[PDB]
Write a protein that binds this ligand. Sequence first.
Ligand code: HEA
Lengths: 62, 231, 97, 61, 49, 131, 57, 110, 172, 87, 101, 105, 222, 151, 77, 153
Amino acid sequence: ALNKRNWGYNAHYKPELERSMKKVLYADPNYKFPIEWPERYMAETKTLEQVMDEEENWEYYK
Amino acid sequence: AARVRTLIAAGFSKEEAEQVAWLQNHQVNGKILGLFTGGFALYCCNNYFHYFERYFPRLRYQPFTKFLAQAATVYFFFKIGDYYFTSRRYGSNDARMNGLMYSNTYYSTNKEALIQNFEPLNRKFTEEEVEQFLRNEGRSQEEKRNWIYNPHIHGSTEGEWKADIHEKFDSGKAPWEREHVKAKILETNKAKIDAGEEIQLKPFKTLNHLDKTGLLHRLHPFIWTNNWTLL
Amino acid sequence: RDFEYNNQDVNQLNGAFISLVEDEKIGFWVGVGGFAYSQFIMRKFVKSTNIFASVTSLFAGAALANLYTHQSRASYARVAARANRNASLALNKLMEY
Amino acid sequence: DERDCRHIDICSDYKEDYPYKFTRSGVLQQPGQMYWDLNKSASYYSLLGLGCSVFSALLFL
Amino acid sequence: IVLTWGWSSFQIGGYNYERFDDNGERRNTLYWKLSPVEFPQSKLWNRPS
Amino acid sequence: MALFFMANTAISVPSVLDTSPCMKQMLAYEDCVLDANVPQQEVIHPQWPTIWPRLLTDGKLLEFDKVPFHPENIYNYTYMRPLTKKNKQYLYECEEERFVFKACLRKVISLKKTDKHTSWDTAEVANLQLT
Amino acid sequence: IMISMPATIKVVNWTLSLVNGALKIDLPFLFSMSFLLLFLVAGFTGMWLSHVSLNVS
Amino acid sequence: VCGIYVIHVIYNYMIPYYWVSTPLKNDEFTRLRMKDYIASTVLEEVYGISYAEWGWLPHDFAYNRMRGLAGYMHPDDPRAMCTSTFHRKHKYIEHEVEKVGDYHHMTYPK
Amino acid sequence: VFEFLFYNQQHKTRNGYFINHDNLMLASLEERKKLIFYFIANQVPEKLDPVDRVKFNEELSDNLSTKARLIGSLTGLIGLVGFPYISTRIYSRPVLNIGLSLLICPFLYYVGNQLTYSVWEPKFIANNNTVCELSKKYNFTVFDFAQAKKEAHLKALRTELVSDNLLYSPGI
Amino acid sequence: DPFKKVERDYHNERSVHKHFASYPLKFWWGLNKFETIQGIHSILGNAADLVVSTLSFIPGVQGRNNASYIENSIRVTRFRGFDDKTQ
Amino acid sequence: MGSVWFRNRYWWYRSLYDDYVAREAKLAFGIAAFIWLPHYYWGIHLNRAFEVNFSHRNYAHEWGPRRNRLAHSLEFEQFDMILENWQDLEDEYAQRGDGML
Amino acid sequence: MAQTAHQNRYQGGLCYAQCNELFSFWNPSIQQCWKGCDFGVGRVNDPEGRIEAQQMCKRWAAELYWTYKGELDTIKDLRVHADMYPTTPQNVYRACLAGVRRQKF
Amino acid sequence: DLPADYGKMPAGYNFLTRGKDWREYDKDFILRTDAVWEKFQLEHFFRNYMKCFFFDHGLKKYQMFEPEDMYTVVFEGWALDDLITFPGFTPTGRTNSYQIGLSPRQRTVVPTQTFYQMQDYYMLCGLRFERWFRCDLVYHDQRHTKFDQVKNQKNYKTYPCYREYYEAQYACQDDMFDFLMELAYARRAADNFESDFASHELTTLPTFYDTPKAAERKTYTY
Amino acid sequence: MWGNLWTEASYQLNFNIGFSSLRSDVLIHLAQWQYWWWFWFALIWSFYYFIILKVARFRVLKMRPKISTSYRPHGKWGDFLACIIPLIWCINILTNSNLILRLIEWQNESSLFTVRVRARQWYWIYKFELKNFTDILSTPKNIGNNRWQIN
Amino acid sequence: MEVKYRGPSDDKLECEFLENNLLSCLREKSVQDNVAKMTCRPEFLVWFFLECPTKAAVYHDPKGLRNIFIQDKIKQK
Amino acid sequence: SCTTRRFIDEKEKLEYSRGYNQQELEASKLRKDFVKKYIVDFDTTLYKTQVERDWAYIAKREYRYEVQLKSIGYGGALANAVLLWRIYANKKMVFWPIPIVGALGYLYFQPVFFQKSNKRFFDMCNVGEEYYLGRERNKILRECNKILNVEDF
Ligand code: HEA
């Protein structure tokens, strides 16, 4: 437990500002980010038109 | 070197008493080592004190100067021991060099952290915090207490009390971490706020600022005598 | 509402405190008497200075008072140590978060 | 201002480039001949002269 | 010759140069925080190498 | 080298203290934008909504009249894509940070170098440069 | 790097033999001293050139 | 001492090179990797990093740790398997890193 | 084992530091309030308000703090009788005289301060209207007393730790 | 100003309040560890209390009331647990 | 240090070289310490300069591009404020078509 | 072990030592398993810890070599062969998973 | 946290900030006292750092020339050549100031660790070229109709030997590539496979890596 | 020099003593190694100060000559004892080289870009491969608080 | 690292080019990029903020900006 | 840089030669009090923030060299001159003059040095509001600016 460390995994942005709405959003266990940190740097294989259609047909977690 | 039972007599946990004893033992053992080293010198170089009278004639003529010189030697030995134990003596936090007192790293780090991280509560514990502590009788055991919500006894809503019960006991959020308690404390100590004095919500965590093993500061242990490897 | 001290420890402490007060009064009187007796005895047969006589008298009076107040003070100290240790442990276990 | 101590329009890092032109204060400043330094030298010389004269007067007795 | 200059000439020269020439630095720089530091003399002239 | 080769360890040398005016706000905005992961690269600028409004309309950043537009991959001509609603949704999560950064930049812009700055010569020495 | 081990022995032997003796200064002695002094610098230059980084530079 | 140094070169540089000579149908890549790793991982070439602050200054350690970690980027390097940890703070004093396993990127030390 | 000379001892036997929970095991409710107020104000006045701290410090000075110092000063001045105690026309030993005077005076000052404290502390603490008013205003609890005791012990440890290098402190 | 002696300042909260001159001068307080010395001090206090009651027979001064639990506790525990090992 | 550490110095002497330079060695050691002080001071100064240079290089690597981006953003924000003022002017021109002209 | 968290191989620990038993003496899979075991410190005893460790291992493997989105999610066999060199992102992910699985306490 | 849909993007949120009282964010920021001097220095540094171009007045446009020796800049200023127009750091003017790093390495067919013991990649280039030549000979003729060399680029498929060819080009130099290409042209005109004459393994020592049941050798485990 | 940023890094003047420029890390390390080697030889030279004076003052024929009765030498550990000084210098040189070399050697496969340098008769040729162009677009950017983004 | 020093130039021709770019950018972005031909180069506008800082004061001056807007409308007319 | 340090030292010498004024004298007294309390007599290791500790240690080293060491050197020179005169008088080596004149010279030149680099030392305290030392320095600087009617940084 003493030596357990993050090692740079899922390094999401930690807003220090008090008026940050995302903070409250980041508090929500049901909050969904735009993409997973494990896949944030993965090569995209989808087509441009398919990606545009999927992004247009997206719903907010809240 | 602190009569560890006496340290627990004042406000000190068993581990906190151990840390305070470690610091006091370091200081006292350094001073005692210096003083006792001074003792054998006078038991050995007493003739050397008399022989060094040809270079300094007044000593052979003024007897009190001999006692003054003996006291000076004792003080020099004590100060040498103190500097060997109670000085800064910063060094590299290396596993192959820690443990052996080539530096005073452990004691220096503990003292510096204690000086930097200690401040008074600057306020009185709220009655709700007193009540929460009063309701914390034996709730820290290994088995989680099955908190039963009785509407005739707990009132409110069954879920609301269950969430409140979790926040008070199961979640572990401190009474100093309660929103209502924080608001009440803000309302109360306004006079101190009239002087701009910050309010300390949590008491000074002794276990979070001192460590005889030194793991808190993350100083690697001696390579030859530690099975565990830090960091 | 607040924490309440243990019952048996409280009773023992009360008894020890009463005994200690009585022994303190008795020892003060005994020490005054011993100081007077020491002053007289030193002025009787001792060929020494008045400073030495007074120092001996004060030291002997303090020693007599301590001898009269040994058992009571020791018992009070033991009771206080046990009570304070128990109370401190309980309070630390209570306020620990 | 006479006591500006900045005779060249350059910062401490000297971000300006040579030739570094003089400043308005440096316009009036005379190197080593200012009133303050001249008065300091005058005071040193007066102190030395007063000491020597006192010593001579004591010897003249 | 053998002892004095062989252990003081280079250091004295470096001290005098840094004191009077500021390590031979060009004056028109932007900020010391983001500029290369012109170190003083490091190859000892009195040394054979 | 050796265990003691330089014979002097300059532990006094501290990390150079950064003195940018609104670096904290700018970095917070950048971190929020990175968490959002907006495909358009121009969004990194705080004034991006006022810089290229076509990004919020069609993504038509530049005129391709003379240079032909021949996209090959998804990561090609990324400046030529409108902001997707989901991305726009993620764009709302950083609005407060963007506004704070803009306010800080505006306040810095309002600053001037007046004559009262008598220590204009002694700036770097004040600005943690005498290391 | 290990080759310099024999040279140091030779320099030490020369220096030691030059001491605790009945010196009769001849023209030959000055030339031998000059040769030793010249050999002193050359060994240091060769040892410095033995460093891989310095040689590459 | 020289012969021991030579024997190490003899046992780890030439004779393995004389073992495999022609393209092989079965595990040619494995045999070549074994042969190369038998020679590319001599400790005299890698053992420096264990005590690096002796040759790397305080700020120099921070400046080089970024390149050093980036130096062993491609995992396909058996000799890199022998090099010491490039994720260590300066032994005397480290100016940048507070916690070793607290980084903002899985491949960037800061 | 002579830490009584190697460690600070003046702060121990004064300012009501001898009080502890065991004492509160026998005191009454109003007595508990008064004792808690006095001990908290003495050891850790930070937890109290500034105006109340000022008033309590003024009361403590008017009662024992200045009075114990005055009594110790009187005892030291009594001990200061005949500063040239060992003096002669042939030679007056300034070293021995100053040394004896210094050895006598501090002991007398300590004795006087201890006597004044042990005599007036019960009366001042027990029968102070301002102290009673402060106890009514505060009404510290047992948890407050425990926290204050811990803080006072930490402050005592800090005082010795602060004056650890009084000769040369480059800081490294 | 006494108010200046009440302000909470970190530098004030971390200032060495004891000079080297206090090392020797306050050294006499350590004798309290001695049982005989503590007893002598207590005897002096008791005699002073008797004289104080005798003088408190005069108006303006109240003697040591034997019904004060606080006073009794203070008198009986002023040196209850003195220990130079602590602090 | 020297002949003291050995139990038969004569033997020790021969065992090295059969030559004696002991007094030279002692005087040389004293003079060597007395001279070694100064080069130590100079090397300390030089090492401090080198460490400062390394720190400056690291900081420029870390803060340079960030400062440049911040300056660009400041210029863009000033331009945005000016553009907002010009847009207010254009709105006035829309409300005052030719009156402003 | 430049990417590992231990100064020496003997300082690697039993988990890292198990890495030596995992692959042959001629594969960087030893270093990969050492990195995986380092990623698993203080998370093996927790289920959510194991999940987050799998995510971290996937992230590290993706950072090492460029692979398509979700490609590592199509590994036919998570089992590893002793002769598996770190040639592919799938191999890297498998080695990291094995290193996480080998971390006790 | 008051509304249930807090954090959901407002509908039709133009994200415009026209006429916003910045005093609200004053409590959200802290400004150094030396802000004026810091801003002036930052502006000067931006003017003197990124501006690697010179505004020619004759064309009334910023122009640039390739980097040259400082003396050539100073002592040979009047003879400027190769002057071009300023294109800008980005087509849209975005800022490119950022610390640079290393992108993830591409998958490799020929492992560099096979012959990494040599500082010169001669044998490595040879082995990579042999592998690429085998792949090309396998997939030579179908490039024009079944690879990227097809006409309908909508159906273009990356050549199956693209990775090997790129790895070989990285391994070998220009002259080595030319010599290997000539040898490959000869071998392709021959259309002779290496296996069409392979006999070396018949005289090779037996190895545990050459057991009969190859699949039985790899003991897979997790 | 591109603009006001004077890219000229050497700028060495005539009759220079040391290296051309200390702008390179290798150059800084070499200078530090040389200075340190010059620093820690003191005692050695000290003996040289004492040996010369004694020989030139109490070893001549007219000043304290010595009758050397030395039939044979009987040294056994002299060479190994004196070899510590060469061993220390060798160790220092090897450590410095291994420190310098480890940062500029055996790191080819982990390269951000690639360029071919072909030296021809009286000329040099710099060849840039096509893939490098793609690598130009694939450079990660450390934006924000050490956050790496790939476009 | 070693960057020299050169203050803002404020050259008449460069200032004219920057002012033309700024006016075009204002006219275009005032329509929120909903114009006929995107002729503005934002990076160039950045130079306007640093190469003609004196003229920037006119941009920071309200009455001066109003007069400039009137002149620009007249020119566009 | 080194040029900046040389310029600062020369400007400080020139200013000390020009004069110390009255408002400037009061500001110097306040700055000296602040430096003595929060820096010179306060151990830099006690500060909460490690960065604050580093900056305070840098300032403390500057004070130890620029003020303490310089004053010690001046006092030592004065002591050497006085001891030379005394030894010339008695034709023998005395012992008291060295320490006595060293202490006197350290006491004397201690303020004068503190009088010259009063501003420069203050310039090493501008850590920022993020540090408690920074906040206190900002308050002190605001008071000095109000006194002097000039905007410092
Ligand atoms: C007779 C001539 C001679 C001698 C004796 C030597 C002796 C040595 N040489 Fe060399 N060398 C050459 C002639 C010689 N050399 C020539 C002609 C070349 C170039 C070939 C060409 O053109 O390429 C060359 C090239 C050469 C190079 C490479 C240059 C190049 O790249 O080509 C190197 C580097 O490793 C080297 C090293 C050495 C070493 C380490 C010794 C060692 O033997 C000497 C080191 C011994 C000592 C160190 C002992 C001295 C004793 C001391 C105690 C010194 C310490 C004293 C102080 C510090 C005061 N020599």
